[PDB]
Design an enzyme around this catalytic site. Structure first.
Site, PDB file in Angstrom:
ATOM      1  N   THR B   1       0.812  -1.208   0.000  1.00  0.00           N
ATOM      2  CA  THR B   1       0.000   0.000   0.000  1.00  0.00           C
ATOM      3  C   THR B   1       0.848   1.261   0.000  1.00  0.00           C
ATOM      4  O   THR B   1       2.041   1.213   0.287  1.00  0.00           O
ATOM      5  CB  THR B   1      -0.931   0.038   1.209  1.00  0.00           C
ATOM      6  OG1 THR B   1      -1.770   1.192   1.114  1.00  0.00           O
ATOM      7  CG2 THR B   1      -0.137   0.100   2.490  1.00  0.00           C
ATOM      8  N   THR B   2       0.235   2.390  -0.343  1.00  0.00           N
ATOM      9  CA  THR B   2       0.925   3.663  -0.237  1.00  0.00           C
ATOM     10  C   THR B   2      -0.075   4.754   0.102  1.00  0.00           C
ATOM     11  O   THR B   2      -1.237   4.694  -0.299  1.00  0.00           O
ATOM     12  CB  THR B   2       1.704   4.013  -1.512  1.00  0.00           C
ATOM     13  OG1 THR B   2       2.377   5.258  -1.324  1.00  0.00           O
ATOM     14  CG2 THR B   2       0.819   4.126  -2.713  1.00  0.00           C
TER      15      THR B   2
END
Lengths: 224, 203, 224, 224, 224, 224, 203, 203, 203
Positions: B1-2
């Site tokens: 994720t980011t």
């Protein structure tokens, strides 16, 4: 009739009896001025053996909330210490004392509890809280039932009604600090000059932005 | 994720990808990691999914109760302090999460909170698996003299770099700009596709 | 006769005595209109030292449930805070406040408990809840025993019976918001115009779909 | 004499005083028919402001047990919620609600407890439970002491004795549903037609095999 | 009237009745001098079988706080032991006994509690604490309600009022230790010389910087 | 005089008052025969609406212990359920119900407790237990104080004394089952034939070795 | 094991295999993994058997108590939030299960919940051992413009692919279509065998 | 990280770097590790971030409550004893931190506290990752006959050596001098840059 | 050990071996693993001996209390649900057992419960060490059109195969047929030896 249960018509007799206990106390008052708020307690140092300045009825709850009390002095000290540790709890949890209204509400809930339950008498003490928060200057009252009301100026003690009558006539909303403490002393005078003496009272103030300043003995006599 | 959060002049832009896995095996091509936590502040998620959604529910509840009891919004330092005390009251049955809460009260802020509850301010921050890439491009291109449009273009370029160079991120980017004037406004997907096709990042 | 135990014929004397305690309070009322619901409290700001707008008797429980109270104000504040944290519990657990009836029922169970047990007096407070849920606009009453009833329009306080008589005659079910608050003010007038004054009251409304809106000081005087 | 302790001759005065409290309530009744059971509560919607259909005194405990109550309405709601969660406990534990008699017995044990101990008054509420189980149609009564009795037809409330006299004369055991609800309405009539009005009552039924069906407003007036 | 609940006008009858219990005790007093503070208890060794010196009413709380008590001697011993372990708690926590006012305040909170709750009588005992801290010499009183007051000189016991009258007339603030204990003995004399005898009293002193010194039997007779 | 404390001369007034509460109940009796024991309760089905056979006062505690009760029926049901789960505890622990005397003793200790403590009334219920164990046929009585006595034949209820007089005259120790139930019915007759009716009673028996058998409606009328 | 849930236009189709093992050693050729949890929503099971049956009993109880207290059905977001809070209140004596709850309230939904309680929406989802196969065929053939018949044909083709290419799945497929009009209707085994023989998947 | 505290004639100088990592991956180029704990004493942080910020909040609260109840400041021995009892009441769910509290009451002090709560006085102390370097230069250059200006120059030379020879430290140095006359005064960044450019440590 | 339970037309046949070990070291050549749990249902044991005997005592107690309170027998779904909730309330101090409860209420049933409390129905089931052998022969020979005599012959052939091909099983087989007409009847050992000598399995 003899514990916090209801009346034949809608009265809590013990919480009444606590209100007449706080009518038997020492008078004190407080008022907002243009950019802050002051608290003046009468201090009537009776004997010469009492360590005049070291007895303090204006006590600090935090560097940005102060309190002056009236009624049973023991219940006063216990409740003021509860207010101190509750303010410290909010400093630990949220990082700052954002609302002084939350601080008076938690203390008043504590008083409502012993108004509510049996096996304990109500707190026979009344207090007024003063200080600035993010909202601004606030001045609160606190009642043996836990009732709170917000004022621009209020009183407590033996000279409740006489002082509140003078404030009801002669209060001006936006007022410089000097004329504010002068008006407060005139209020304290008119009531307490029935023993034909006042004394030097004790008085603290805040202007929004600064911390707390309690006067010394010399400064209050200039306004006396 | 980011995740990514940028403080600029009078605004704060927070955006995430939307791809949730939950396995190796990318499973949900459209998740939700950008949450409005109050009418002027939002929160982004970069950890274990269930624990973080519990955190979002709790913080929505506590800030709404706060706004109700006090008739004013909570400051950003207060919500990060609250969130840090929550994560640090239990760290031996811990939450494995990296939270990032941004918002504006009288000045814009974006605060980062690790799994141990170390709240710390920064003018731009990022969390998640594909986080060093967006730290690279925000180290190279970000200036604090930007507008809102240059800011959201920078953010989309960042998350596009992270989607190109990382397995865990991906999916459709969603962005929300929170400013004091218009409040918290999440951009519709049409404007996001417009900026993607304009900046030459579409493939 | 002096704690919550039964009568010689079927009466709870303390819960009665609590109902006459809430008859001694300040009047307030509420009514549904075509697509929402309003609450109007009389606010009778007695002295000029009270911070008129900052004392609020219409208090929010959630962005989609409001409450106005009458009776002992301390028990009022404590019970309203219980309602607030219960609504927050349902937001944490289920994700949304699906039924406002569940919210009034949990609070009323809390009041039934201190109606039920010894060693505690009943809550001497009455409330009305208003708001929309998934079902639609709802308006509830709450009684010192914990009795709830659902209304299209109801009252509470010193002007219970006079207001309820006016509502019993002159209420129309589907009504635009402007004529609704006008009918509510006429209700509050007819009762409270025995001290030959009303004042500016406080009044909040919701239409289904929107959040909460409490009027300001200027808007209510147009309908006054 | 003033708490649940015994009499000079064998009486529990508080549990008596609770029975006269449930004599002061609203009447309701129920009866078995050929393959099910019905419950009819009188609903006497007094004012026009009450949300007629949304106040319900026939409340569901499970899709296969219903209950109608009489007495103090707050104790009623609390006890009915206890019955609901107890039925849910038996669904979690055993997989199904095998006996409705177990469900009335647990609730009646809960009422016996506050009949038994000091520091709490008895539940001033009476209920009747209705529904089918594996055994078949059952109809139970529940008493402020926790006494249960099983009936083919029973009553509760202000019209206890008048309705029970009519049922004692005119009840037929195996009866089609239409003539059953007609006989029940005639029972409710003969008692409650002393205020020379009945109203539309509320009435629910089950036939063994199907789930629950509460009538609507239109259907009950055909049998009225 | 018979437990700590309020009066018809603002009085706690049990805490009063405790104050008349401490009026029935043995007299004692204390006073500050130029650089320390003394405590003199009358010790009236009645029979010759009492082990004169081993009964001590001036008891040490720490090497830098002492206490002399009056009233019910059992409540005295229990409360003094509570003060001892509280001083030890502050030594463990903070490293030193920084304020003796904190020490009197915790003990007085302990007395306020049994002033506050039912199911326990108040502590029928009064104490005075003496010693130096970082601030300097302090002398405190402690009251059955938990009231504390700070003095330069105070009394307690049967000769409360007579001694306080002599102190009110003849006290000088800064005074060498010898003339201080002489003034204290003259105070104790004037009151207790109504049985036309005094005896050898017991007396302890501190000057700031040194530890505690309780006199022996021989030294006090020189000032007698 | 009004809770379980002692008399001016050696009486527990509440436990007496419970014994007159169990004198107000329905009569029942039991007796041993040659190789077993029977229990016959009068069942006086008053109205025709009571589900005659489904109300049972002879209730099973285990497949090898039965019980019939008299007094307050709610306390009866609660205590019988306690006896059931206690018998189940002994089945879990030891593998079998070796002594029925242990089972009556644990229940009687449960009744002694609420005879012993304040804040609870005694169990106003009396029971008789019947069944075979390893020792053989046993028949026990149980008293509101928790007193147990072992009989060959005993009674309980409104017809205590009349039945016990008939049993005192006409009981024969070793008796075939048919003549045993005939003698029991004659006992129940002579007492209860003061309302000039008996009815069909309910009656259960065990012979040592077999399990339990409660009669049906048809069989008891042959002996009636 | 394998489950499948598909949201289409105004309906949601959920189907499972029926083979329970409980060992390596396939033991029960006809289990039950598709549960009706309320009159308009159902739940599928893909984990440890005992824990999941306890979960089904609890959710049946809580939703029935809900419908009784409120006279309306529970929304799907509420039941997934409830289920997530239940699984995440205890995760250090955890439930090893992968739940999938579908249903319709005003719009069809199918939500996936992992063992940590991460509720997340998707328009089609699958759990279990033979889950990537049905994700493959639902990635290749699913369109949101389908009817109910094309949907249930897609579902049977999916679970047939998973039965062909996986050891843990198998047994007779059972399918239930839940729609707003006819409610929750589970297809009889005769129609399921009819669709199997029609689609050319029988062997 | 690195901290430094120096007691000299009538003053105590405490300074830190500002670089927080929280990962390997230096993440925050401007943190906060130097905290004023009371109007005449301060505290420095060299451990896990979240635990140490909780410690700073608690000590601010306890010392403010102390000053309120007693109308006088707390001594330095008392605050170190309090802090040691706090860290040693829980050491099996321990705080991984190295605290350093300095201040002046009637004589300047700087006390070091390890993770186990061993309070010990020293005339100069340092904690953190880049601590042996500043112990080296303070062993070679420190004299107790210094002024305040020579002291703060020594401190900046120390932390500059630690920034040059260590990965974990870095960022802009912040210094606060606490003396009895002017109280607790934290130097502005302009004077710090002035001393850096004057001493020939800028690069 | 080995157990077997067969549901046929209106009856259910459950049989076990009798050999208890408790060590490697077969110790008791005549144990007891077939328990009547109620007047129309029985239970078989295939796990740790002590825990399972505690389970049998508890279930005898609870079902007898049930029959007493309700004047009717418990259904088989209810007793398996009860047993599953019992085993699954404690699984981290777990019972290592494999229970198999059969019986008839209005239709015959035999339910299997693992150590985690996964209750599942099947028309024939088996548990224990020598269980796959009897699953083999019941897969090859069982038909649901059998009588009671053909059923008990199948059961004895099954347990004879398991005794021949497994170390842990052995000893004298005991069988009980439970039907609605004659109730629960356990066959005497003379008829069991008669069927063994008739079917040609004696050696």
């Amino acid at each position: 009739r003899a514990i916090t249960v209801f009346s034949p018509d809608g009265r809590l007799f013990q919480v009444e009896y606590a209100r007449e206990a706080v009518k038997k106390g020492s008078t004190a008052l407080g008022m907002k001025f243009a950019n802050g708020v002051l608290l003046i307690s009468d201090k009537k140092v009776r004997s010469r053996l009492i360590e005049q300045n070291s007895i303090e009825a204006i006590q600090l709850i935090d560097d940005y909330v102060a309190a002056v009390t009236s009624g049973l002095v023991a219940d006063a000290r216990v409740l003021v210490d509860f207010a101190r540790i509750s303010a410290q709890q909010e400093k630990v949890t949220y990082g700052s004392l954002v609302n002084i209204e939350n601080l008076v509400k938690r203390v008043a809930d504590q008083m409502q509890q012993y108004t509510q339950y049996g096996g304990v008498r109500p707190y026979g003490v009344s207090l007024i809280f003063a200080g600035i928060d993010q909202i601004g200057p606030r001045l609160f009252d606190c009642d043996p039932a836990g009732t709170i009301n917000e004022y621009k100026a209020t009183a407590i003690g033996s000279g409740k009604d006489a002082v509140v009558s003078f404030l009801e006539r002669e209060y001006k909303e936006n007022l410089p600090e000097k004329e504010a403490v002068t008006l407060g002393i005139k209020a304290l005078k008119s009531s307490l000059e029935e023993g034909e003496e006042l004394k030097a009272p004790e008085i603290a103030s805040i202007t929004v932005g600064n911390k707390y300043r309690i006067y010394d003995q010399e400064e209050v006599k200039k306004f006396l | 994720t980011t995740t990514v959060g940028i403080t600029l002049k009078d605004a704060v832009i927070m955006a995430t990808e939307r791809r949730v896995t939950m396995e190796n095996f990318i499973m949900h091509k459209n998740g939700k990691k950008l949450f409005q936590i109050d009418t002027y502040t939002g929160m982004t998620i970069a950890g274990l999914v269930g624990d973080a959604q519990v955190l979002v529910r709790y913080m929505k509840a506590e800030l709404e109760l706060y706004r109700l009891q006090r008739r004013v919004n909570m400051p950003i330092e207060a919500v990060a302090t609250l969130l840090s005390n929550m994560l640090n009251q239990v760290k031996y049955m811990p939450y494995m999460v990296q939270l990032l809460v941004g918002g504006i009260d009288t000045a814009p802020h974006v605060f980062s909170i690790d799994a141990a509850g170390g709240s710390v301010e920064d003018i731009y921050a990022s969390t998640g698996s594909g986080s060093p890439f967006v730290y690279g491009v925000l180290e190279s291109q970000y200036s604090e003299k930007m507008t809102v449009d240059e800011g959201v273009d920078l953010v989309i370029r960042a998350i596009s770099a992270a989607k190109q160079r990382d397995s865990a991120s991906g999916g459709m980017i969603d962005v929300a700009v929170i400013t004091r004037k218009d409040g918290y406004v999440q951009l519709p997907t049409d404007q996001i596709e417009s900026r993607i096709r304009k900046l030459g990042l579409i493939l």
